[PDB]
């Protein structure tokens, strides 16, 4: 229903900031962009529960104790050893929002002037990656080619 | 629904203040800059729970104490004792924002007057990283470009 | 919602003192800066709960006691000892404010008159760096930057 | 809110005491002062309790008592001591108050007359320096430079 | 926003009080004086409860007592004894105020007349030093220097 209008909205956003940004490089017209967003709407929930480790003596957390030690001497001996530990916590709850922006895919039109150089193809295209809200996390993808208009 | 206004907000002041500093170096006009902000909606709770490790005997906080020791001479042994201990504590409750900025990327297009020079590129960038509010810990990306305009 | 017309008060604040101290110095109007402001809305509360040592037994505080000493002649021997302390404390309800200042950056423009010396940007930075509210704590940055206008 | 419309009231007091201070030396209007307040509103309680050391038997508060001694002669031996002691105690609730001035930074301009001397400029530094509330406990900071006006 | 003001009363008490008894000395109107108090007002409240000590023999103050001894002749002995003791006891439950003054600093400006001599500013030191109330527990500060009117 409206996770299109939504997702419509989001596209039109990115596709006219690239277009604003570029347009005053190569001219008023001469470039076109289009934006597909992969939208997320699955309702998300968490809770963690992270416990730091106190295994080594160094920094345990000692609130009980009792430590018998015996000892004959045929050197016998005997080692008890009760211990009561205190231990750090951590609780989230993390409640994720639904709309947000799993991965994006830019196509962008340039056109000549008779070819563009590469050097100014490959600032034009980090220009484009710097605007998207670019991110290899997401695995977002983009390609910038140049062809005659008509 | 919202976000979205939110968000365009939050760019907007950040594009308007960026041109209005570089703008008296390089001219009234002559810059222009589009911003990308990754907005965290996600309602996040918190709560830790911290204890100073006690192990060391220098500074332990003993509240009670038992040491008995017997010993008989074939020299036999022996060593019990119980220790009751006292803990430091700090507990947070940190409620996160919903709004805050997680990352930012900056595109900014400089006019010829015809090349800038390499030391007035550094400096603008370096302006522009000051005034962005820009941090390495977010991730953010900005990339200044010099091309002429049409 | 609020939260940016909040910050674009302390802002206007922060940039208005700036320019009023450096502007009898350098002119009238031969000076701009823009500070961006990163402000912290995360309710947080704490509770500290703080024990003094008492393991040294030059300042212990005993409550009770008890020792017991046997001794035999074939040295066999014997020693008990119970003790019951009191232990200090101090206990800490720290409610954090909701809107401080937890980092800033601050870019100015000082104009040519012809280039201004080494000493007088020096001592504009100092001046600018102490008008801020500057702290190394908080990773604030600055950066003054000389170039004509225009 | 309300914070910045207080924070302004206390730096104006400074400010202007600052000025009305050092004006009568250097002329009516030859000299600026901005001075930028780092408040504190954070609520805060707290609770100490401090207990009087009573280790040593010179000085301490025996309620009770009871010293069993017996001996045989192969001198056999046995020593039993209980012991209930009273104890000092001293009990604080110091509840803070929101408001205080955690740190100070001030700037301070001074006109020549044609440079001003090293000892006027240092005692002018001195009375500043007093004027303020100066205090290197919370890390106050001062810097009064001298240029020519315009 | 009333501390302001109580704090401005303080103030002007004590800078009337200083120019009133050193005016006499150097003129009608050749001194100024500028003063910034540090006042508390952090509610607080103690209980102390204090025990003289009762270990030397010499002023105990017995209750009860029991002592048995016993005594076989290989000499063997024995000697129980149990005490009651009665102690001595202080208690002060001391309500701190509101609005004292932590800490003082002043700053005089006297004048020419050129140089006024070291006697007669070191009595004018001293007076002034006698008139604010100088105490140096709290750390106050003072400082008068001698400079031309303007």
């Known amino acids: 229903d409206a996770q299109l209008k939504f997702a419509n909205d989001v ?3 990115i596709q006219r900031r690239i277009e604003a ?3 005053p490089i190569v001219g008023n017209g001469n470039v076109h962009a289009q934006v597909t967003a992969q ?3 699955a309702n998300k929930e968490q809770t963690e529960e992270h416990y730091s480790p106190n295994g080594d003596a160094s920094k345990a957390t000692l609130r009980s104790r ?4 015996s000892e004959q001497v045929p050197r016998s ?3 008890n050893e009760t211990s009561n530990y ?5 609780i989230r709850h993390t409640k994720m929002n639904v709309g947000d922006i799993e991965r994006l895919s830019v196509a962008v039109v ?6 563009l150089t590469a050097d100014q193809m490959k600032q034009i295209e980090d220009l484009t990656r710097e605007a998207m809200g670019f ?5 977002d993808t983009l390609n910038v080619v140049n062809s005659p208009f008509s």
Chains 1, 2, 3, 4, 5 share one sequence.
Do not use: A
């Not at 009792?66 to 030690?69: D, E, G, P, S, T």
């Not at 991110?135 to 695995?139: C, V």
């Open 21 to 23: 940004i570029l347009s």
């Open 11 to 13: 596209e039109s956003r």
């Open 110 to 115: 340039v056109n000549y002037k008779l070819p």
């Open 77 to 79: 001996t005997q080692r």
């Open 39 to 41: 939208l997320d709407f």
């Open 135 to 139: 991110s290899d996390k997401r695995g």
């Open 86 to 90: 205190e231990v750090d916590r951590t």
């Open 66 to 69: 009792q430590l018998n030690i």
